[PDB]
């Protein structure tokens, strides 16, 4: 209805969620039980913290590092595949398990 949240709320509706809804919310699938690497302290790919699913961990930076400036705004990297945006996005994006 009101996307994230915007004033002029009218109602708050609840219901059962289908598999289609779950896959629509998802930005990607999680298929490795890896959280974080200890040698580099960076998220593991396809893990519970993968940056290609949940978004960058730094403002306007990619996992590979090809783009690290505000100019490369809104473009998905062609090497790492992480969309270049702000780091607060990790509080909003959800994955899913097939």
């Amino acid at each position: 209805g009101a996307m994230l949240d915007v004033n002029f709320f009218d109602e708050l509706r609840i219901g059962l969620a289908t598999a289609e809804d779950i896959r629509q919310w998802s930005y990607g699938e999680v298929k490795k039980p890896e959280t974080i690497n200890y040698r580099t302290l960076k998220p593991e790919k396809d893990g519970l913290f993968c940056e290609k699913i949940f978004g960058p961990t730094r403002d306007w930076e990619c996992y590979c590092g090809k783009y690290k400036r505000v100019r490369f705004k809104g473009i998905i990297c062609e090497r790492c595949g992480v969309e270049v945006t702000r780091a607060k996005v990790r509080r909003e994006r959800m994955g899913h398990i097939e």
């Binding site: 289908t18 779950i22 998802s26 999680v30 959280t35 509080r91 994955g95 097939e98």
Partner: protein, 147 residues
């Protein structure tokens, strides 16, 4: 029949199918709502949600491996049962069977424990908050003051 009709009418009046009770996919909460911190020295203290998601993923992956590779009915059924139990523990830990406990023999927190109780989401964060521009100290008596 009164109770059966209560539930059946609940599912009939609305435009909602009853097929939502069986799950073909599991959502994963955003990482910033289940952060993992590091203790003095550089050793991580993993959250409880991460452990449950990890167990679910392990069991699902090994079940998929067994299914693809081909195996007798018994092993596939056992893996399916263990996956069922893992997802049940993730959603509501301790409801059925022994709780999935971590180190120290203490039950892990589930997605259903973030909302319930005196320390749950509602009563601890939405009905009450911590605020700025606030202080505290001991009170003494001032007779000279006015009302």
């Amino acid at each position: 029949a009164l109770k059966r009709l209560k539930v059946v009418a609940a599912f009939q009046q609305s435009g909602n199918s009853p097929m939502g009770m069986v799950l073909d996919a599991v959502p994963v909460i955003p990482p910033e709502l289940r952060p993992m911190v590091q203790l003095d020295g550089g050793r991580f203290a993993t959250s409880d949600l991460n452990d449950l998601y990890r167990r679910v993923i392990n069991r699902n992956n090994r079940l998929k491996r067994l299914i693809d590779l081909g195996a007798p009915e018994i092993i596939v059924n056992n893996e399916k049962r263990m996956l069922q139990e893992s997802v049940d523990a993730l959603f509501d830990n301790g409801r059925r069977g022994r709780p999935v406990t971590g180190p120290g023999n203490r039950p892990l927190k589930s997605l259903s424990d973030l909302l319930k109780g005196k320390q749950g989401r509602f009563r601890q964060n939405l009905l009450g908050k911590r605020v700025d521009y606030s202080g505290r100290s001991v009170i003494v008596v001032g007779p000279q003051l006015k009302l």
